[PDB]
Amino acid sequence: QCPRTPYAASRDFDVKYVVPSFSAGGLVQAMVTYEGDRNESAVFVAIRNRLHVLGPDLKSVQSLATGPAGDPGCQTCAACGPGPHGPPGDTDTKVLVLDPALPALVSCGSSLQGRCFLHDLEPQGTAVHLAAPACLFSAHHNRPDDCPDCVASPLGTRVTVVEQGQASYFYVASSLDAAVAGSFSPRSVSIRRLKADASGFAPGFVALSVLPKHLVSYSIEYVHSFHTGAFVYFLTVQPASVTDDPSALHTRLARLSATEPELGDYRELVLDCRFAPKLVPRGSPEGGQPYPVLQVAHSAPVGAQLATELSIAEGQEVLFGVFVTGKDGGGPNSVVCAFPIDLLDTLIDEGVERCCESPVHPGLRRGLDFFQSPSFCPNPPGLEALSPNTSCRHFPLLVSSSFSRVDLFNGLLGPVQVTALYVTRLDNVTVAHMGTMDGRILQVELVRSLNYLLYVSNFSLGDSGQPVQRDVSRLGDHLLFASGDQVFQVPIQGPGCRHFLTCGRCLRAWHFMGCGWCGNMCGQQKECPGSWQQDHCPPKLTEFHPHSGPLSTRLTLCGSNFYLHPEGTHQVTVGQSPCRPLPFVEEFECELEPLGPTNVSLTVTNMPPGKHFRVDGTSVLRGFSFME
Amino acid sequence: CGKRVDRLDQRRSKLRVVGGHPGNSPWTVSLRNRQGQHFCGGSLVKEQWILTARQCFSSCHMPLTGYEVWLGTLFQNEPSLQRVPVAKMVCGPSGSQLVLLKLERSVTLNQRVALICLPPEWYVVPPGTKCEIAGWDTVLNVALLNVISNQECNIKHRGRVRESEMCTEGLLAPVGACEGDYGGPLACFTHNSWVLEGIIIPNRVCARSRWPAVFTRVSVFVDWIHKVMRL
Numbered sequence A: 001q002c003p004r005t006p007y008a009a010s011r012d013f014d015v016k017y018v019v020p021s022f023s024a025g026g027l028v029q030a031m032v033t034y035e036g037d038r039n040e041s042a043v044f045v046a047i048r049n050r051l052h053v054l055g056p057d058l059k060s061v062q063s064l065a066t067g068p069a070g071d072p073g074c075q076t077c078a079a080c081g082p083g084p085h086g087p088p089g090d091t092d093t094k095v096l097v098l099d100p101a102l103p104a105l106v107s108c109g110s111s112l113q114g115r116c117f118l119h120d121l122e123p124q125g126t127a128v129h130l131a132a133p134a135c136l137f138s139a140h141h142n143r144p145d146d147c148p149d150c151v152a153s154p155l156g157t158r159v160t161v162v163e164q165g166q167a168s169y170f171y172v173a174s175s176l177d178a179a180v181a182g183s184f185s186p187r188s189v190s191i192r193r194l195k196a197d198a199s200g201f202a203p204g205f206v207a208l209s210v211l212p213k214h215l216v217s218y219s220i221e222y223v224h225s226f227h228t229g230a231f232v233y234f235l236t237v238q239p240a241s242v243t244d245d246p247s248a249l250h251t252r253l254a255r256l257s258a259t260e261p262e263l264g265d266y267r268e269l270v271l272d273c274r275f276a277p278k279l280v281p282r283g284s285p286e287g288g289q290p291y292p293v294l295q296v297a298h299s300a301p302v303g304a305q306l307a308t309e310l311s312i313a314e315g316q317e318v319l320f321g322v323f324v325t326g327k328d329g330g331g332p333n334s335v336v337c338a339f340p341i342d343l344l345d346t347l348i349d350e351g352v353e354r355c356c357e358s359p360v361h362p363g364l365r366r367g368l369d370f371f372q373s374p375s376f377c378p379n380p381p382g383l384e385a386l387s388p389n390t391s392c393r394h395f396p397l398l399v400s401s402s403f404s405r406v407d408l409f410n411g412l413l414g415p416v417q418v419t420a421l422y423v424t425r426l427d428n429v430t431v432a433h434m435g436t437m438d439g440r441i442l443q444v445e446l447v448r449s450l451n452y453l454l455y456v457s458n459f460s461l462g463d464s465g466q467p468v469q470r471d472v473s474r475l476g477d478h479l480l481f482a483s484g485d486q487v488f489q490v491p492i493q494g495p496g497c498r499h500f501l502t503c504g505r506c507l508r509a510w511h512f513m514g515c516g517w518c519g520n521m522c523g524q525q526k527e528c529p530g531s532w533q534q535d536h537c538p539p540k541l542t543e544f545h546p547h548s549g550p551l552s553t554r555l556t557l558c559g560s561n562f563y564l565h566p567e568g569t570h571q572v573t574v575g576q577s578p579c580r581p582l583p584f585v586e587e588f589e590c591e592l593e594p595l596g597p598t599n600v601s602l603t604v605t606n607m608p609p610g611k612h613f614r615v616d617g618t619s620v621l622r623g624f625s626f627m628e
Numbered sequence B: 001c002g003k004r005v006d007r008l009d010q011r012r013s014k015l016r017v018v019g020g021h022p023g024n025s026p027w028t029v030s031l032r033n034r035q036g037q038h039f040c041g042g043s044l045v046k047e048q049w050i051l052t053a054r055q056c057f058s059s060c061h062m063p064l065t066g067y068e069v070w071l072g073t074l075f076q077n078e079p080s081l082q083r084v085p086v087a088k089m090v091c092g093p094s095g096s097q098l099v100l101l102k103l104e105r106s107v108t109l110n111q112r113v114a115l116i117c118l119p120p121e122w123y124v125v126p127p128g129t130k131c132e133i134a135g136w137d138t139v140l141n142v143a144l145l146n147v148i149s150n151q152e153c154n155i156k157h158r159g160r161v162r163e164s165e166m167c168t169e170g171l172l173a174p175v176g177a178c179e180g181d182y183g184g185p186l187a188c189f190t191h192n193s194w195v196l197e198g199i200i201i202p203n204r205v206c207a208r209s210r211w212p213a214v215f216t217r218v219s220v221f222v223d224w225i226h227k228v229m230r231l
């Protein structure tokens, strides 16, 4: 009887695509991209001590020396003015962020006490120059117990730039230790106005810094940060407690207002994604197995078919997070799982409430011991009564109820760690543009998938097989990925249609790919527009059940492209001479008649449209004897 | 409110318009930080209240006790003075960039201390109208300004002047309300009275020949302002 063809055997991801790129000079340290008004645009790509401005075709129009410090070349360092400017060493680029309002580009590296640098953008016909830099470090305002201009940490930092009113605000998070906080500190969290005279950053601002005792163990990574709605959000990876093992990491989401420059509302939520494999593995507490370390994330609006899942409305922003296991487990390596934004808020709002009201659950935790002082809700840090002069809600807190979800891909991702994510919304559907450690790109629809991934593309970025950099950026219909010393530009609609090995999968492609079936291969129109067609597709007969009958006989034909979405009405079958149609794989039953080791041919004609594509044609198999 | 004969010039220093110069501004004040130095300037709206800009302060909830106001003087470094501490602060609604300020004790008026008239709710200032702007060398420097429309200035400001703002036309002189002068008032003369229509806030580029200047519109938020004091 009937066999079964695995939904692969149609995908062949071993097909290579060349796709334009840009040699760096060395390993890429960051990138960020402009999309100005006059359809102007750039792509800015940094390395160790150089800065690369690119055109809209990854062609380096202007490069510029960002280091080394203590060495008469690097313009940034020289624009700081008459020396000394030190200590000397290599300038490694920890921030590359642009302020759309000026416009202007920022760049802050691990030389020069973490000072930033401004680069007024100078336009060109679909191109952009960076006019010479202007050091963001006021001489007479800075000091070792208070350097307001110290934005960049050498231990990795992130910055989100925000327009409030008529000046630009810099929400800012940095990791710190002893050798950083010691003196000329960048300070963990802060919000900073950029002075209108470009001289740097207005002094004063309240900022937060992991307290002296916990500078050593409790190091916080800052994986990602963004602006949406009326809030700057900050995405983290840190130990689950001050007194628990420093090897016990766990991702959180830290929030701040996007219209209200103060840390008085420093809310922190604990995200918590896990894997749920039916069986449930050994050391895991029901619900799923925890992947508590985020390796990248990206927020984006979702499609119809995804909003329904997740129970939300089309258009709504949704953070997505690419979680890996604690340390390096042993199961799938990467789990991606959606957190929608509104609901992250609505938790944190009811997070706030339960901490500040009439009856207060006695024995709660405002917490964040690592930042401020411990204190039970509602009363503020250290202090033991809530004196009505101040409020409760005007203090930083940690919303205890964590936020929990389950991998969107039931562990199908599989063993190769995902390293970079960029979620978009290609028309009414939605797609995740994943990058892996083994040097490959995974463009895959983002529907909660049960049994398999809905592949758009999986292919290797170039030949040097190297991990794809976290921070991924975009231009028109062309994402930029980075790996090693190179930068690649992948089109949002996946490069080719030449992995779909069968007119089956090929004509099931999501419109935008342009995929049509050119006879004995799939491909866009470019590749064979004599015979490129996107409509019809011929039935493939694989085998049958009774393989030798007498001169009735209930043949069961077994193949694919048999049904409409069973079928019936009209399909011919000539099993050496007349048979008779009588009511993965698609099977069938055919009672046959006498004659007055032949082949077995099936033929679909005058057949109505399928959802995706139309079935018509003949395929003929051998091997059916006659018995007397 | 809002009446000086004082600076014999009220309608006679419209000659020295092209340029910034020294002069008097009684309602303008000088907010004094905890350490001692001047850091931002204000606007006497009542004896108890000082309307000023949100950006002067880092956080709406920082302890103020120590923060003080200096009404009376011209110079910023002599019993022709007053020294009133700040008791509290009231952070105006998202986007006002406004900050009222109750004082430890109501002030006393004279020649160089005077209230200023708050405008009607949502009353718009006609282009062509004349307004003034004080600021801090070691002395005050008033300067007279021409009002222009949000139409007019959104050209040069690249369509980025929101509905709750106004702009004055650019002085040809390189002089304008910039750093350390924010929160100082933008008094406009109407129906024989000076009337607080704006508040010096940060601009993108400041004190730049022939370039406009944006201020936050007070009439736009006065219903808030009264509510803050009345009670």
Ligand SMILES: *[C@@H]1O[C@H](CO)[C@@H](O[C@@H]2O[C@H](CO)[C@@H](O)[C@H](O)[C@H]2NC(C)=O)[C@H](O)[C@H]1NC(C)=O
Pocket: A013, A014, A413, A414, A416, A442, A453, A458, A459
């Ligand atoms: C993307 O396709 C590649 C190509 O096969 C996959 O890499 C293989 O992974 C399988 C298990 O998935 C290994 O056992 C193979 O030996 C791998 N070999 C090579 C040469 O790649 C990868 O698994 C695919 N990823 C996704 C999401 O489909």
